[PDB]
Amino acid sequence: CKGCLSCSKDNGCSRCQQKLFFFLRREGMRQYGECLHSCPSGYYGHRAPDMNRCARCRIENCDSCFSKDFCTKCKVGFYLHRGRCFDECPDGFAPLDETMEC
Amino acid sequence: CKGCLSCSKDNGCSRCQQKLFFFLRREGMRQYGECLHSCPSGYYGHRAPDMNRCARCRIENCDSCFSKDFCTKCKVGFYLHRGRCFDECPDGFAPLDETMEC
Amino acid sequence: RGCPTHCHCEPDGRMLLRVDCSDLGLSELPSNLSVFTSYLDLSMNNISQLLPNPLPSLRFLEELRLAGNALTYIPKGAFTGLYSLKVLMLQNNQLRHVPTEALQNLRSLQSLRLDANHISYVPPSCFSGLHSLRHLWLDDNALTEIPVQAFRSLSALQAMTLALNKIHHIPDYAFGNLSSLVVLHLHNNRIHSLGKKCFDGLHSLETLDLNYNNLDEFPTAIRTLSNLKELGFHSNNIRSIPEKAFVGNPSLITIHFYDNPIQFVGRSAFQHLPELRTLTLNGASQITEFPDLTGTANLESLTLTGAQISSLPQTVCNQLPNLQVLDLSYNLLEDLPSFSVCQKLQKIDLRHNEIYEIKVDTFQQLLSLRSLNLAWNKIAIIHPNAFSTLPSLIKLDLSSNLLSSFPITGLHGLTHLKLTGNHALQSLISSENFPELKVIEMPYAYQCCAFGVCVQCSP
Amino acid sequence: GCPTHCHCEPDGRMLLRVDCSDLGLSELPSNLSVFTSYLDLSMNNISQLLPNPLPSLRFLEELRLAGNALTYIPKGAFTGLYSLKVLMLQNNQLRHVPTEALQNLRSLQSLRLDANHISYVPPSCFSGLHSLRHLWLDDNALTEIPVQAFRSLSALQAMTLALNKIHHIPDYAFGNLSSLVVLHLHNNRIHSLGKKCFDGLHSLETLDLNYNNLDEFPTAIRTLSNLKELGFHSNNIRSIPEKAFVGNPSLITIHFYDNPIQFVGRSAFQHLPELRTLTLNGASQITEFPDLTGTANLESLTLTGAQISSLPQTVCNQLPNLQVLDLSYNLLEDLPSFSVCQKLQKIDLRHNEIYEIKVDTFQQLLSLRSLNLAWNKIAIIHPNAFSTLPSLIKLDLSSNLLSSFPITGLHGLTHLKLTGNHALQSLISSENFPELKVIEMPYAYQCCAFGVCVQCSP
Ligand SMILES: *[C@@H]1O[C@H](CO)[C@@H](O)[C@H](O)[C@H]1NC(C)=O
Ligand SMILES: [Cl-]
Ligand SMILES: [Cl-]
Ligand SMILES: [Cl-]
Ligand SMILES: [Cl-]
Ligand SMILES: [Cl-]
Ligand SMILES: [Cl-]
């Protein structure tokens, strides 16, 4: 219940401090709310006046995000190009093996 | 089933001939439709362009009725006046025993 | 063997005889009827003539049923000798006019059923001498006009139906001498026009039914009906209810006028009706003002939708102390008064208006309120204590508003909550500020999951 | 194997992840391994860093300083961090972007400056940041676009300036951000845009102007030829003009709910062959259904609260892929045939003025699950109108003017709603509707007859 304005027993945090991101950690049988400075791997932080939350990366073959349609680091074996992840790095630009990109 | 355009099984009549009244008999578990020329005692017949139906009288202390709010014969021990059933026959006109009317 | 062959018989309360000879395909009457017969049922047979009858000997016969036979014609003397006859049933036969003479002078007759024949003509004096007639059924025939002359006689009549015929006009004084008439049913005719005095003479009338007709104009003729308690003119083509419309009808409990293209309603139209229990207007476009209900304090239900109502008076609940249902969906409401003086309210529907805020006192101390619907407004703020004193509140719909947060206090008893279409409402809400919730519609699915659902939650 | 109280784990077979977050540290720890690829110093009490062991961390790729007490970052703070790809300074007390500490971090790809109190971007604070791809400046005190500083970031692909106080965007504000793919400007106070305020953004696929104060349709998007997603919901725009999206043929998504939209040009939504959804609620001055020529891939169309009184006979020819149609709350009287709309799964025509349903209207809609015709003026339905709707599951004909109701093709229903049809006094029987689980009859006696005095009301 760190970074939390409004805590509880079994649910963890329910409302975060102004500038932090809400994230639902899921152990299985029960789930707890958390207030984070940045979102964990697989998620991106979305700010709004009322609250900020970690939302899931919406992108094929992506491991990390800037936003829901912009990838920042692709799944293994896929090449990063303009925020997207492709098997073959499409014509017009070659792939950088050493770099894992285009 | 009698007087009926649509005889179901596991059931009574579902739609009656044009000028007959539908009435829902309750045998106990199963209920059955019937098609009557006038409605059984405690009910009035209601006619509409494609469905005539026996509706129950819900006038208090009444046994038969013409209409929803017009009684035609009260229960035992009650007096009929303008289609309403009274205990005391209200001032302006007294009871009159031979008929149980006012 | 005290009963005719194939018939079934039973003593009545006075040990006079009830004889059932219905549904035996008889073409002629049975032979050996007891002079002590009080009831004779000859329904559903093939009787087209009553020439050979033993009826003259049935001096105690009170009720005769001839429904569902093939009568086209009833001769002068058919009911001679039935000096006790109270009820005659001739429904569902093939008469094309009311017999000219057979029904005259049946002095003890109280109830006459002529319904479901093909009757197009009521001869001028066919009810002559019916001094005792109380109930008359002429429904489902082919009448094209009120038989004004034939009804001149019947001053003892209490209940009549002319429903399901082809009557197009009711002239002045059409029922002019029916001073005992309590119920008159004219539904399913083709009545377009009513004389301005067409109901004069109906001093005792309590129920008038003009439902399912073709009226273009409000029936001014009811002004005379000072004892009217139930009035029905639904499913017509009426376009306005004028001022002082019900000024002559202070006893009205029930006025039904739905499925009329009503557009305008007069300022005063619904004042001074202390017994009226329900009022319902759906689709009344040109109504810009909430009606004055002075002297009309007993409404349990009020529905006024599809109009141009912009405001309600601050003191509107002073006129609505017994109101249990209020429906003003589909108007232009912006500012709500306080509803607290409407102490009895159980249900409030204010969907599809233009409401922008809920204040602290709008819903205060409505202890019986169960369901409140504010869907499709423009609500951006709800005071945090707006719902503090609604212990009965069970359903709350705030769908499609402009909210950015959601109050807790006073809503622990909710079973139904609806919030979809509030995009800015991104705050969570936790499962035991709302332990009793069973249907939730959230703005986002992550609000469902955080609640503990990923009990019905959408999305 | 690790600074005291910190937590360390291998990152590969050589390098090291060091977690020193949330230890209430006032100063950096002392014995930091040269093997450190990742260092987390978040949630601590560090107000500046001058006594640092950072210069020896030549393999450090990620440094996290979120949620500390930083007001000031001195010029040499990050010298020697040749490998630094990610720098996180969000949730600190900076009031302007450090004037010099951030220049010439040549490896730096991601910089978080969000949730500070930044009111000023010095003109050359980003000089030398040629690797910078992602910049977060969301939730600060910015009052205009720092045009100057942004000329030095032409490799930038993603940026957010959301949750600031920006009120105007001048011509060429982003004019050398030719690589920018995503730009977020939501929750600002933008009230006016230059007619060329987005020129130079050749690569931009996403633009987010939601929750601002625009009075006027941002015609400056016309140069954004690669725009796939546009958002300008929750502004004060009343009109979408003719040829509005003519420069944006790849748009997949355009969101503009919660605007007081009233006009839409005829041509506005033509020639958008990738657009999947169109949604107009409350569009109350609209009198004609918009032309969708060359815009054939809509899966959902919602157009409500308008003055639409008829659809063109041939309207489904432009809606071959439509799955959801919502035209509730209009003035529709006569319906065309929707049979060319083969993919329809839901039709909502509630609160119109529809007077009959013909044989032809809904024929061969094999995927139609749900049809809502509540609150119309329907007095006849053709007996075969629903003959070929094998997927029909929900039918709502509440508050119409019916006096009869078809059986043919409705044995599959689970939901039937008939209340408010006063003339419908005829009986419906459970044999024709074995699948019903929710029923609203015109009268309670009709429920009883059904076998119910599985839910029937009243
Ligand atoms: C009314 O009917 C009664 C009874 O038949 C009769 O005495 C009288 O002449 C009639 N009066 C009028 C005004 O028609
Ligand atoms: Cl999500
Ligand atoms: Cl009933
Ligand atoms: Cl004759
Ligand atoms: Cl309810
Ligand atoms: Cl500085
Ligand atoms: Cl609705």
Residue numbers in the entry:
A (entry chain D), B (entry chain B): 40 to 141
C (entry chain A): 32 to 485, 539 to 543
D (entry chain C): 33 to 485, 539 to 543
List sentences from the manuscript.
To provide insight into recognition of Rspo2 by LGR receptors we crystallised a variant of the hLGR5 ectodomain (from which an unstructured loop had been removed) in complex with the Furin tandem repeat of mRspo2. The crystal structure was solved at 2.2 Å and refined to Rwork and Rfree values of 20.9% and 26.0%. The asymmetric unit contains two copies of the hLGR5ecto–mRspo2Fu1-Fu2 complex, which are essentially identical (r.m.s.d. of 0.5 Å for 559 aligned Cα). At the core of the interface is a hydrophobic interaction site with the hallmark ‘phenylalanine clamp’, in this example F105 and F109 of Rspo2Fu2 pinching A190 of hLGR5. These conserved hydrophobic core interactions are surrounded by more polar interactions which differ in a subtle way from the hLGR5–hRSPO1 interface (not all shown in figures): The side chain of N123 is found to form a hydrogen bond with H76, an interaction that was not previously seen. The salt bridge seen between R144 of LGR5 and D85 of hRSPO1 is replaced with a water-mediated hydrogen bond to the backbone of C78 of mRspo2. We observe the exact same dimeric arrangement with a twofold rotational symmetry in our structure as that seen by Peng et al.. The LGR5–LGR5 interface buries some 900 Å of solvent accessible area. Residues I293, Q294, F295, F301 and Q302 function as hinge regions mediating a domain rotation of 9.6° around an axis approximately perpendicular to the horseshoe fold. The structure described here represents the most tightly curved or concave conformation observed to date for the LGR5 ectodomain.
In contrast, R-spondins (Rspo1-4) are the sole secreted potentiators of Wnt signalling and have emerged as crucial regulators of stem cell maintenance in vivo and in vitro. This further requires simultaneous binding of Rspo to the large leucine-rich repeat (LRR) containing ectodomain of LGR receptors 4, 5 or 6, which are well established GPCR-like regulators of stem cell function.
